[PDB]
């Protein structure tokens, strides 16, 4: 038998349903989602980190001339100068007044320290959802990890359950993501091979151990000071460190709907948005005939306490009279009130106390109890606390 | 080195089995066939037998098998097997045989002793799979090369293993014999036996090479004597009773696992093409049944697939977008029309 | 798949029960009223009340490495190409991504190949690979296999060591005086699909897109156009007076 149901997208709350049959007893269903993940499909483009200015020892020739040989190191700058009078701690490295030539060559390489201290770029698309559910059908408790696409149901005890696609494909992530130190920021990083000096992306390395990088740091060599040996060089500071000083706040504290982002695998938790359609195919074995369930007679309901707070704050006692003693499920067809428990123990002439949540000042509604309808009416009062530490439990009707 | 490969099957013995059809009828045989596998392309098939090969009572080509508990050996070139035509035995190793012979419907395996012929036939399908798209019955002398799957010729430790089990109790009516008034039990030298009887009350006795007689029993048919062995495991055969307790003491590798190799595949004759305005005709003459696959190079292919085993005529239309076809195993041929 | 039969469990002249090993799609049954036989005559003495127990199961065959079928889901095809570009007699062969970014840089020249004008992909959402051939087939999803058709056995990987089987294995009454386990199940669906074997994508693809699978890919077929954007610096533009007129 096919049964369609709707699930609000919010973990931490229970949800009760009754499956009605004309000739058989109603069947209870209790569902509690424990954790929902919105995992994006992300690919890896490149990695960047601190760079280190490499240089070879200066090439000094005395009364002669030199030539530049290309090593093809990334962003290599090679230059030759003349008119130098070298010095050393022991004395004069030359006897020539002029014609001495110096060759200075410089380049960059990835800093050794950034095996872990590396910033990663990312491009994300086509987020998929994965929910962990606790199901109780026919008082059979099970915990399941289910896929919520248009296929891939789960089978247990013959019950088949399929959760349809999301009602909304919204994703907190933008196209272009940046990952660093377990923090995820939406940033518009430039693409491969088009970096600029001073900004994020002066260095471009495909992988951590690619050993093939493209660098654009605007490195410029300078005339060495007379009377000493060195290679003066100048380049813009690290765009990585400049972006580190900028550091706009995190998606962890700026994303809407209160999503919780985690970075072991990139994922978003408990994004409270939308609803999940679910379809039950229940075998006829679990369905119970009417004669096997107690039937009430002359039952009345009275409200003992009223607080229409966020939590369950309406307590009602039902005085009934039953031929048989057996557990059965109570249900509220309307959205006026939400019952807490899924079933209540039933004895031969006892009274059943039930807890529920409502937002109406003057509640009045009918309880389906296992064979019959019973009216229950009353007026109710506000709470005493202006703020609470848990979300809403019942819908707000017009 | 191969003795380290042979070492696994030094720990086991052959076993008698039931076979539904000896030369006489329903029968107990040493050459009962458990299973047959035929997945290789060139007709290479694997038989799982109840005997052992390559081990003497280490020798190259021999068959080691069982006779009422007594192990015997025969040269390998005496046994034969067939389905529709005489097959050819290549090599044997342990409980497995590799055979190469054409299609059929049943597998018969037989051999001849000095005066008694042993055989039986099992009806398990054997299938011959052609490679490519040229159906044949015997691989050609010449052609081209392709990659199909054939069964490897040599044994090596692969990732496929089987399970042995502790042998059960084997009843032997030969051991029991009638004395003047009692029943005489004579277990074989160096082996233990279990005698269980109900001639009087319940009886159970483990004899260890002891010729013991039991009172209160007059006839011999009332009760049974068994044989006990601890070493020399047996395969998990469905034709034997099991021992007592957990039935597991390791596993053995299975040789002759399939592999990839180079395959000879026939070549069809060249079809003679004749061209006309936006059309082509293929004068065609096949040696064996062969596949035509034809496609158009447009948004929709109108793909046509056809098996022809006789000379025929086909007229095809070609447009500027293009026509493509494969006959046999030739590289695909693409034709592109022109204005004229 | 390979049917694995346990050794027939005999307790003649007594009684037995079932011990589930929890192997995939295992079936355990108990039969009474058996008079088994062995080469050395009858096994035991009691005429009736003899209990056989037969346990049968299925395990992946030993030939699963070089003879197996894989099911894949395909979406968001990506295009790239190998170009040989000669501008200002500067000829280079280079790989380029024809997406809307990632220019190729040489001699100061930056070439951007924009996205494809058509999103046509020669693969359906589901595909099946087997022995270097690809077929667009609607295979049933994992866990919903049907006997006698594709997907009777479902293993997460070649060595997952855990499979879900739906082969409809049913035991039968053993023949009198014979130690054996008579079983019945539908033929494997993989060989039936092999018998069917509709023509492959490399012979039925539109636009003639040649399909090779070192990785699953398609090549050499004409659909649409590549927009090209040239970013040329001002240095390579030569004076006319320096050129023949």
């Amino acid at each position: 038998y096919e049964h369609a149901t709707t699930m609000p997208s919010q973990a931490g709350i229970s949800y009760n349903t009754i499956v009605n049959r004309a000739g058989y007893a109603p069947l209870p269903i209790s569902i509690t989602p424990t954790k929902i993940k919105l995992i994006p499909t992300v690919n890896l483009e490149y990695v960047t980190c601190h760079y280190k200015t490499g240089m070879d020892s200066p090439a000094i020739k005395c009364c002669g001339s030199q030539e530049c040989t290309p090593t093809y190191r990334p962003d290599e700058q090679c230059k030759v100068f003349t008119g130098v009078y070298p010095f050393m701690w022991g004395g004069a490295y030359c006897f020539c007044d002029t014609e001495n030539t110096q060759v200075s060559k410089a380049y960059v390489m990835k800093s050794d320290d950034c095996l872990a201290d590396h910033a990663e770029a990312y491009k994300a698309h086509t987020a998929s959802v994965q929910a962990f559910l606790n199901i109780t059908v026919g008082e059979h408790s099970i915990v399941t990890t289910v896929y919520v696409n248009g296929e891939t149901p789960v089978n247990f005890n013959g019950v088949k359950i399929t959760a349809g696609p999301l009602s909304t494909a919204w994703t907190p992530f933008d196209r272009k993501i940046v990952q660093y130190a377990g923090e995820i920021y939406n940033y518009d990083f430039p693409e491969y091979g088009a970096g600029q000096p001073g900004a994020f992306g002066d260095i471009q390395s495909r992988t951590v151990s690619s050993s093939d990088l493209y660098a654009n740091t605007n490195l410029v060599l300078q005339r060495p000071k007379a009377g000493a040996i060195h290679v003066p060089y100048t380049q813009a500071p690290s765009g990585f460190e400049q972006w580190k000083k900028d550091k706009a706040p995190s998606l962890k504290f700026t994303a809407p709907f209160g999503c919780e982002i985690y970075t072991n695998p990139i994922r978003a938790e408990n994004c409270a948005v939308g609803s999940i359609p679910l379809a039950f195919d229940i075998p006829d074995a679990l369905f119970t005939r009417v004669s096997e369930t107690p039937t009430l007679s002359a039952a009345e309901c009275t409200l003992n306490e009223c607080v229409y707070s966020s939590d369950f704050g309406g307590i009602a006692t039902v005085k009934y009279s039953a031929s048989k003693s057996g557990k059965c499920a109570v249900h509220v067809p309307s959205g006026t009130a939400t019952l807490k428990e899924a079933a209540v123990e039933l004895t031969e002439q006892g009274s059943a106390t039930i807890h529920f949540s409502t937002a109406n000042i003057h509640p009045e509604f009918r309880l389906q109890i296992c064979t019959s309808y019973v009216t229950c009416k009353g007026d109710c009062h506000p709470p005493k606390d202006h703020i609470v530490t848990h979300p809403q439990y019942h819908a707000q009707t017009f | 080195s191969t003795e380290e490969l042979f070492n696994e099957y030094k720990l086991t013995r052959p076993y008698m089995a039931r076979c539904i059809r000896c030369a006489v009828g329903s029968c107990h045989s040493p050459i009962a066939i458990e299973a047959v596998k035929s997945d290789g392309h060139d007709g290479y098939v694997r038989l799982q037998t109840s005997s052992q090969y390559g081990l003497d009572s280490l020798k190259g080509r021999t068959m080691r098998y069982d006779m009422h508990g007594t192990i015997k050996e025969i040269p390998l070139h005496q046994v034969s097997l067939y389905t529709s035509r005489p097959c050819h035995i290549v090599d044997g190793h342990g409980y497995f045989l590799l055979a190469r012979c054409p299609a059929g419907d049943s597998i018969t395996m037989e051999f001849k002793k000095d005066s008694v012929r042993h055989s039986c036939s099992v009806p398990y399908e054997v299938k011959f799979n052609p490679v490519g798209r040229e159906l044949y019955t015997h691989p050609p002398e010449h052609g081209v090369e392709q990659a199909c799957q054939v069964y490897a010729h040599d044994a090596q430790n692969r990732g496929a293993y089987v399970e042995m089990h502790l042998p059960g109790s084997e009843v032997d009516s030969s051991l029991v014999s009638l004395s003047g008034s009692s029943v005489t039990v004579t277990p074989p030298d160096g082996t233990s036996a279990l005698v269980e009887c109900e001639c009087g009350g319940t009886k159970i006795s483990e004899t260890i090479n002891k010729t013991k007689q039991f009172s209160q029993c007059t006839k011999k048919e009332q009760c049974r004597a068994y044989r006990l062995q601890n070493d020399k495991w047996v395969y998990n055969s469905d034709k034997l009773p099991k021992a007592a307790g957990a039935t597991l003491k390791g596993k053995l590798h299975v040789p002759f696992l399939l592999a990839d190799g180079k395959c000879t595949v026939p070549l069809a004759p060249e079809p003679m093409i004749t061209f006309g305005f936006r059309s082509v005709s293929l004068k065609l003459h096949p040696k064996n049944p062969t596949y035509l696959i034809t496609r158009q190079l447009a948004d929709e292919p109108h793909y046509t697939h056809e098996l022809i085993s006789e000379p025929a005529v086909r007229n095809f239309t070609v447009t500027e977008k293009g026509w493509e076809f494969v006959w046999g195993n030739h590289p695909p041929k693409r034709f592109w029309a022109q204005e004229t | 798949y390979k049917t694995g039969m346990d050794s027939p469990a005999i307790k003649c002249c007594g009684s037995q029960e079932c011990t589930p090993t929890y192997r995939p799609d295992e079936q355990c049954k108990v039969f009474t009223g058996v008079y088994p036989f062995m080469w050395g005559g009858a096994y035991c003495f009691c005429d009736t009340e003899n209990t056989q127990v037969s346990k049968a199961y299925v395990m992946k065959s030993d030939d699963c490495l070089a003879d197996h079928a894989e099911a894949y889901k395909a979406h968001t095809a990506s295009v790239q190409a190998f170009l040989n570009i000669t501008v200002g007699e500067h000829s280079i062969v280079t790989t380029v991504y024809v997406n809307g970014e990632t220019p190729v840089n040489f001699n100061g020249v930056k070439i951007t190949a924009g996205p494809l004008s058509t999103a046509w992909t020669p693969f359906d959402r589901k595909i099946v690979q087997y022995a270097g051939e690809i077929y667009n087939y609607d295979f049933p999803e994992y866990g919903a296999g049907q006997p006698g058709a594709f997907g009777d056995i479902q293993s997460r990987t070649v060595s997952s060591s855990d499979l879900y089987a739906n082969t409809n294995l049913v035991l039968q009454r053993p023949k009198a005086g014979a130690i054996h386990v008579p079983y019945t199940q539908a033929p494997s669906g993989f060989e039936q699909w092999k018998k069917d074997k509709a023509p492959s994508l490399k012979f039925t693809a539109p636009f003639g897109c040649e399909i090779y699978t070192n990785p699953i890919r398609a090549e050499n077929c004409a659909v649409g156009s590549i927009p090209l954007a040239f970013d040329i610096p001002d240095a390579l533009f030569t004076r006319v007076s320096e050129t023949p007129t």
């Epitope: 995992i39 499909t41 890896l44 998929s128 | - | 894949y72 990987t157 070649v158």
Partner: nanobody, 122 residues
């Protein structure tokens, strides 16, 4: 993006014993097909070894002289070479097929490493 890095090989005399190691790194959890391929100068690519879980395969000309071992925990494949012949001069590549990304953005199916050159001197 998963990549394969090859190591080992080098120069050796006839009859020597070497090792080749290929390692996979990236967003991968479980791997199915480990394979090795050799390409001599002037000839097309060919398979030499093929490992997948417990099973191992070998070609016709290479039986009894090469051994392949796979470590799924490290996602590495090691090829032990013994008693090499002058026909073995070629460049060896390591292949990975049937990659299972741990969601794990679905991506390219197969990947290829740079490979290593092996040369034996007569």
């Amino acid at each position: 993006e998963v990549q394969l890095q090859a190591s080992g090989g080098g120069l050796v005399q006839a009859g020597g014993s070497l090792r080749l190691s290929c390692a996979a790194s990236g967003s991968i959890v479980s791997i199915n097909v480990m394979a090795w391929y050799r390409q001599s100068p002037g000839k097309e690519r060919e398979l030499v070894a093929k490992s997948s879980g417990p099973f191992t395969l070998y070609a016709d000309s290479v039986k009894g002289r090469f051994t392949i071992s796979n470590d799924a925990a490290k996602n590495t494949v090691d090829l032990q070479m013994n008693s090499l012949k002058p026909e073995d001069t070629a460049v060896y590549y390591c292949n990975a097929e049937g990659l299972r990304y741990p969601s794990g953005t679905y991506g390219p199916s197969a990947v290829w490493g740079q490979g290593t050159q092996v040369t034996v001197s007569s």
